[PDB]
Design a binder for this molecule. Sequence first.
Ligand SMILES: Cc1ncc(COP(=O)(O)O)c(/C=N/[C@@H](CCCNC(=N)N)C(=O)O)c1O
Ligand SMILES: Cc1ncc(COP(=O)(O)O)c(/C=N/[C@@H](CCCNC(=N)N)C(=O)O)c1O
Lengths: 512, 512
Amino acid sequence: SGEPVYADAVLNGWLTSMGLGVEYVRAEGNTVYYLDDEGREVPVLDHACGFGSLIFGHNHPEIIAHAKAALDAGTVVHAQLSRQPRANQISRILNDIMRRETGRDDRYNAIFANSGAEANEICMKHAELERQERITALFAEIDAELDTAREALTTGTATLDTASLPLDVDGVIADIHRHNDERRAERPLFLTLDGSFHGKLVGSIQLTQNEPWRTPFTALSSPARFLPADEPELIGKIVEDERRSVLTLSLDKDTVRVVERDFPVVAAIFVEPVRGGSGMKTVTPELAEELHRLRDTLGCPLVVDEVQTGIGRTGAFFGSALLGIRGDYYTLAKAIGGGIVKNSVALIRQDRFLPAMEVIHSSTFAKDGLSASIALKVLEMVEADGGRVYQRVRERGQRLEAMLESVRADHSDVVSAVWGTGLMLALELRDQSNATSQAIREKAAHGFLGYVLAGFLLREHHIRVLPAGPRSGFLRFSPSLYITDEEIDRTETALRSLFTALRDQDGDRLVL
Amino acid sequence: GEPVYADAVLNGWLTSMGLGVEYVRAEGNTVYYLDDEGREVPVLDHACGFGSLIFGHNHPEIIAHAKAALDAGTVVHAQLSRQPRANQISRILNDIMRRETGRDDRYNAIFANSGAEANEICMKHAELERQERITALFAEIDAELDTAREALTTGTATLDTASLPLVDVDGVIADIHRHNDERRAERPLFLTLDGSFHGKLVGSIQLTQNEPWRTPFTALSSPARFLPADEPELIGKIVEDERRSVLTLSLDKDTVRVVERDFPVVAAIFVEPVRGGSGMKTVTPELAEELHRLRDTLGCPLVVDEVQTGIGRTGAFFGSALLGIRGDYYTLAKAIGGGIVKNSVALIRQDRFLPAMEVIHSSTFAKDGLSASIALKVLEMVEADGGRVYQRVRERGQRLEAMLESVRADHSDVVSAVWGTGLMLALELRDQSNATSQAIREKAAHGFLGYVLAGFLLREHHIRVLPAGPRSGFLRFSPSLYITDEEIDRTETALRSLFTALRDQDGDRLVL
Ligand SMILES: Cc1ncc(COP(=O)(O)O)c(/C=N/[C@@H](CCCNC(=N)N)C(=O)O)c1O
Ligand SMILES: Cc1ncc(COP(=O)(O)O)c(/C=N/[C@@H](CCCNC(=N)N)C(=O)O)c1O
């Protein structure tokens, strides 16, 4: 209509036209409820689950009860600049878990924040502290090399070689200082994988491939180079083209030369163990070895974003441990809030950790007492009974993956693949840009196909699926570890129904 | 030398300042620590989450509403579904702003997880607006270049060679396109006030004056120019130096000239109504009028950061309404989570709001059901009983300000001023860098004075104060609206004690 609206007009307009215009009024385990026209609750199976936030489902009774107990105990939520031992206690548990799963006896400092993106930006900031340490060291050495060369050229023990000048003593040194100062002030680069998703704040958005989400904001912040994960022979040459030089004077016996030395341009490499923005593709061993090489070569940290793959989703606590990704920094977020509060953590290896970070970084809401308590509960639950929860994820993941595989095998004309691991899975949809049906074709063309297919699943089978990937070309399946055999069977029926409709090009049934 | 997993440096530093205490419980204006015998010691909290706790710690009505929302099975994670509570919150905030400003302006709401995230939504939207202006300018320049190319080939006009020092028809146009393309890719500027605090993420940190917090990160993101608030005759010339030009061809009858046109460099102006990082200084009417002039002149939005001054702190809902600051965008955070959860909102004027922002911006945890419910409760509480809560803040503020003034008047040798409004107040400490006492002098020299004085207040009067401002040169007083007459008297006694010890240069009593 034409009445005043104060939020979400465009978002709601667009959700309605996709068939996703529903208000969920209540949620319990793997079920969200909307009201029909008569005001009765209609149960919907949730495969989205806060984009993998709800490993234990919606409003887990043990988490709700813990939260209520912490509220009634008068938990100190706001205790800024006082002792909060729970931060140390959480970091200790995460350290013990990482040692168990990797067999490495490595120690990590924890910095807390309020979202996945804030945790990735603590890592970007710390990576840049490390880069400024390397730069200070390099520039101190260059000053000493310049002083030494200036001794040998004035004293008279050496001659300037004029073949090097395409890069008078005092004038050449001032031209070097100018060149070097320009280089020093240039923005660094981050390296990501193609399809990368690392958040949407001013810094983190540059690390997210999705072109409409990022390219309006290019001018604001340091960019990333999106390395091709599938073609990792081309990564070496792409990173090689980003080499940059500072100048110094090199004294060898009686000849002084202007020479190029390497400048640290790359602040950090980011990687998701399972690539959310890419349709849940797992990092292959070949790509892991290439990211290890780049980290060893450039001397910048490798940051492992486990915002989505952490707290058990993959069948281990850390998906990095499962896939052999050997990171310097790790980030966690989604499941650590128990599906009720907001919390995130950067783990930074203690032998790289710059203690200035503990006093120059802060946030009003970070390390709050309520999300600290709930974190310790979530970690108790995921660790309980000698790690049977991870075994439950692996066994539920296998059941759900096998079902999605059984559907692909009979629907390979519209389903190109199953991707992911544990309970972080996706179907890849074949391109429908040449679809017989105009309505399907137009939606594929605008990048809206997955959204439309999700509407079908909602209105005809009462199943909530959300798409992933850049043109909604993937369907996400990230339910809780309590997903039942009967819910997996109902999803199978729904998907055969959906993919039979798609084979038949039934635009009247699929598109509203 | 035992294994530590967080906060070693932060805790070491708090201990040496006299602030090494663990709060075990909190209620109203009181936090509790345990003495050596295990008894709870009540401490009066003047810090209150840096102005998060207008209603105090764990307000029974907020705790009860939170428990009710959890027991109702509120949907916390309902991403890409209808969430009418966002619209309902934005509507209440719109109604309140109309009442306090008399302006019938409408605002769209985008939610986030922290004060910094809300400021970065504003930075991102400001940059969308700047990219619209740029597209418009570049379209006009293409048309001007086509018209000038007609008149120079057709033969109706002559190129004036006096204008060529800004760069043959085709070659001059290619030199213009190159110049313009370089300009287009340059990072924008933000304008802030000196002492500004707008958060500490990759983008927002550039908007925060405090040099140790910001300067390590300079290379990452667009900078700000910190305008001098006190001397606003110099603002004009500082913004004037940041003028940048693109080139075009100007056809005037039969002469074509290369000319400079204005390029939109400034993405946004940020302002706090009460300047947190400046020791709680209120924006004066002269400075307000200068920020209005800059916004009208540059055509970028004025973003009013009410993360700290919002939700009633100043004796109105919006401190911008109280001080006559006419913003385009507003941010809120601290008190809106009820002292228990994390939430923030950007209000953007609907006649500037670019609907792409509703579908290209998102966050996992933003607009969650729990903080949405608690927001509506906090807004009900602050609006209740025909605005008597604002009256209570004004009346509590006057009582606390009068007390701080009565202390300054008798302790003007060590207290230089009282700043702020409502329940957002501070004492300015006189410089102690020339202090008789070595231990006081050394602490003043490291910028640690306010922290040390806060330790005295904790161990001797059981009062929690934290410093503000860049060299901890201010003491913050931002308690809840329930602060009692007796708590204000106990603070007076504590401060006379502290400032008599400081007058006497009693370093053995003040510094551990
Ligand atoms: C691997 C990774 N790193 C960072 C973040 C950011 O953390 P934050 O959101 O700030 O808490 C996330 C979130 N992943 C979900 C997010 C939903 C955002 N909205 C839409 N995608 N529509 C996803 O890929 O869809 C992440 O997965
Ligand atoms: C006006 C304004 N804009 C943004 C933020 C950041 O919002 P966020 O912290 O990200 O939620 C704040 C916080 N202001 C307080 C406390 C900061 C929290 N602790 C430190 N980081 N210092 C201050 O002046 O000390 C703000 O006041």
